[PDB]
Amino acid sequence: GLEALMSSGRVDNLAVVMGLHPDYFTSFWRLHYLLLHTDGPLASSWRHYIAIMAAARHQCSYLVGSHMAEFLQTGGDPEWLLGLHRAPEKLRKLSEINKLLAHRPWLITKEHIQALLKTGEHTWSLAELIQALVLLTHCHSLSSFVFGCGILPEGSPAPQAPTPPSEQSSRDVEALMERMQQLQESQEEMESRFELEKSESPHPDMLCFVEDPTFGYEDFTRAPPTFRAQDYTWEDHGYSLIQRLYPEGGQLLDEKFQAAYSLTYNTIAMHSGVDTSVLRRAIWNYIHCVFGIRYDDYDYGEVNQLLERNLKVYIKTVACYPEKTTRRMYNLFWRHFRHSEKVHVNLLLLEARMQAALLYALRAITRY
């Protein structure tokens, strides 16, 4: 880890936990510093208010409190913190695309984009809309990281991951490895194995920053639509679109997705020789399968073969309903795995989630 920084009291509480993995922290901090501290298309107070709205969707009083204080510090109009009905017309148009990015990103059509542009009064640029979509998705994915790892506010970095015993000098798992073995050596029931996996399945003060609370991943009126990843990948399509509209953060989103996907110590909770590229691909692909994205020649039977019953319910909670994550749930999966590796899954998860959300919104922009 980056232990001298972590144990120092001079840094953010969420940043400390992330310090366990320095290769991801490098890349995460670049985007954090670009979005919230560098000259960009939107004023510095508007960026902190977009982040409140985004984090309010999951009732995250950690991130709403940070950006509330930073909004005020950076010279934001304090009326705006009384509620969303007090912010400019430009910023309320954004809370229809925000609830979708958070909860049901597949529903983002071209009409949502059109609404945000071309009107007479204070309409959004592409330069600015792109930056706001990266802020909204960044704060949704930090919001799932905060509840997943248990990050407590400032006034014990977490109640789930104990850092002070974790810092220092000191079975069935083998089964999982064996299974990983058999996969490495190796057509119409491929699409219908994805279909089964896919359908398988308070706090008064921050309701005022959202349009429609209780909008949720779940229908409550009765499975996303199936989407071929090759139609609109990150590598080919979506990276080019962010590159042309917002040059600085296109490169830093690519390096950070690739940093969290690539990240391995080649270990499996006290075993050193494995290549676990197979396990991490499953975690990444399952979370894309929750957000409706099928990969064209990936065997989705591999998922519940490698991922426990309790890792699945944990991953799906943290990705979709991040509040109502409990410590019982965090402990109840991968019981013999090290605390740093649970954080690792939170990394893969947030980044997979973000990519899915971003890809649907960029799909809506190119179709316009």
Author numbering: 66 to 220, 225 to 239, 256 to 271, 280 to 294, 308 to 328, 333 to 478
From the paper:
Sestrins are a family of stress-inducible metabolic regulators that are conserved throughout the metazoan species. The structure of hSesn2 displays an interesting internal symmetry with two homologous subdomains (Sesn-A and Sesn-C), which have a similar structure but distinct functions.
To gain insights into the biochemical and structural properties of Sestrins, we determined the crystal structure of full-length hSesn2 at 3.5-Å resolution. Despite its low-resolution diffraction, we were able to obtain a high-quality electron density map by taking advantage of non-crystallographic symmetry averaging (five copies of hSesn2 per asymmetric unit (ASU)) and the high solvent content (68%). The crystal structure revealed that hSesn2 belongs to the family of globin-like α-helix-fold proteins, consisting of 23 helices and no β-sheets. Although Sesn-B was originally predicted to have a coiled coil motif, it forms a helix–loop–helix structure and lies on the surface of Sesn-C. hSesn2 appears to be a monomer, both in its crystal structure as well as in its analysis using size-exclusion chromatography combined with multi-angle light scattering. Interestingly, whereas both YP_296737.1 and AhpD are characterized by a catalytic cysteine dyad (Cys86 and Cys89 in YP_296737.1), the Sesn-A domain contains only the first cysteine (Cys125 in hSesn2) with the second cysteine being substituted for a leucine (Leu128 in hSesn2).
